[PDB]
Design a protein around this ligand. Structure first.
Ligand SMILES: CCCCCCCCCCCCCCCC(=O)O
Ligand SMILES: *[C@@H]1O[C@H](CO)[C@@H](O)[C@H](O)[C@H]1NC(C)=O
Ligand SMILES: *[C@@H]1O[C@H](CO)[C@@H](O)[C@H](O)[C@H]1NC(C)=O
Ligand SMILES: *[C@@H]1O[C@H](CO)[C@@H](O)[C@H](O)[C@H]1NC(C)=O
Lengths: 279, 99
């Protein structure tokens, strides 16, 4: 759908001591890594053979590295706010940015900064303002310095209105080999011991791409509604950009119901994957 | 805030003795980001282990996938060993073949 036109940036600035920064950062379109920051060199590694000779042209790679809001300035801005807040090292800062394009015209864009793994300040595009997320000095100082920097506010506007939208569009056109790949799930059902004289039925679903999926249990062919008896796990990644999930249902032994796991996934179309529990 | 890692150990495909597979250790929900993860075979560190690029979720907490090609056997035990500032000692999670 439109997960494919969702561009995100994740940056971690671990400020060890005064002379030490360790960086990580990633750019994603959907769940496909497009660029990864190399911690040793601070250059943007390109992750896909279809990504390289495209931008390039929009110089997103220049924006992220050398510009007013680029990593080189950001690192120094973060060292400075730690300093101007009287705070001590180590400090970990994080930056989460996104741009989504809906196929009705509208865009969702955001910039979030955290410190120590909690929100710190957010950027309000419409209000041309950075907003504090916590109620202390570091939050007040960073939010005020950023909002006062009217050129930064202007620069971010252009970024989210022009630069990132054009980039998504070009990447979308070039990257279908990853963005439109479909690999159907396979599933297995088995039973294991559980407490209170119950059985745990497990449906393990593997190998699937893209990520969204729905796994339900059927009791005599009708959907089991959610209760404490039913747990669907979190989706887990494989190294090959496929996913795995486990769903479980507590049942009483010899209850006289037949059970099956049903898996709905867009790669399957109108047909579900249906997997009976057999004793 | 500090957050201790969730550690989930699983294979790529449902396991069958003698057929190659991938062993995965997914560590997630941790803060700060420094972490050490080893995959073990019969108690000893496996040498050729890859991992994904560190990133983080909406709640700011970090996640990493470590993985290795392996061939399960009846006699061999596999596990994931994690160290993190929130742990007093490394946490070992054995691979449950159901996973
Ligand atoms: C690509 C999205 C940009 C969002 C980056 C987070 C905002 C940090 C801005 C800091 C850069 C300001 C210029 C440096 C000034 C200085 O070093 O004092
Ligand atoms: C800063 O940190 C690094 C290692 O994390 C260390 O080697 C370096 O000497 C430190 N600098 C000082 C002395 O502040
Ligand atoms: C980036 O590329 C170089 C190869 O030129 C490689 O050695 C390095 O590990 C890469 N790093 C990342 C994290 O992409
Ligand atoms: C356009 O799409 C956005 C997001 O899906 C939505 O918020 C907005 O209401 C839509 N406008 C219309 C009326 O199509």
């Amino acid at each position: 759908p439109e997960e494919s036109q969702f561009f995100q940036l994740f940056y971690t600035l671990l400020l060890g001591n005064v002379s030490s920064t360790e960086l990580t950062g990633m750019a994603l379109l959907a769940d496909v890594p497009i660029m990864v920051l190399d911690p040793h060199t601070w250059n943007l590694n390109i992750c896909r053979p279809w990504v390289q000779e495209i931008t390039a042209e929009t110089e997103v790679k220049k924006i992220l590295s050398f510009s007013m809001v680029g990593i080189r300035n950001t690192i120094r801005f973060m060292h400075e706010m730690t300093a101007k807040a009287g705070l001590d090292y180590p400090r970990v800062f994080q930056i989460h940015t996104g741009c989504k394009l809906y196929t009705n015209g509208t865009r969702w864009s955001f910039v979030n900064i955290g410190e120590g793994g909690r929100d710190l300040v957010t950027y309000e595009l419409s209000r041309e303002r950075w907003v504090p997320q916590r109620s202390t000095l570091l939050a007040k100082v960073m939010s005020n310095t950023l909002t006062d920097l009217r050129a930064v506010s202007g620069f971010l506007e252009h970024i989210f209105s022009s630069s990132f939208p054009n980039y998504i569009l070009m990447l979308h056109e070039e990257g279908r080999t990853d963005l439109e790949r479909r690999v159907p799930p396979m599933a297995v059902v088995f039973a294991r011991t559980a407490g209170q004289v119950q059985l745990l039925l497990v449906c393990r679903v593997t190998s699937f791409y893209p990520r969204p999926i729905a796994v339900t249990w059927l009791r005599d062919g009708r959907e089991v509604p959610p209760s404490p008896a039913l747990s669907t796990g979190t989706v887990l990644p494989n190294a090959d950009l496929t996913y795995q999930l486990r769903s479980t249902l507590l049942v009483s032994p010899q209850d006289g119901h037949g059970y099956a796991c049903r898996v709905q996934h867009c790669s399957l179309g109108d047909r579900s994957l249906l997997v009976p529990w057999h004793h | 805030i500090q957050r201790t890692p969730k550690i989930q150990v699983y294979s790529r495909h449902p396991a069958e003795n003698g057929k190659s597979n991938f062993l995965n250790c997914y560590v997630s929900g941790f803060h700060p980001s420094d972490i050490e993860v080893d995959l073990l075979k019969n108690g000893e560190r496996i040498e050729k282990v890859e991992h994904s690029d560190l990133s983080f979720s909406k709640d700011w907490s970090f996640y990493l996938l470590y993985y290795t090609e392996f061939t399960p056997t009846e006699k061999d035990e596999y596990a994931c060993r994690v160290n993190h500032v929130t742990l007093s000692q490394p946490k070992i999670v054995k691979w449950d073949r159901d996973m």
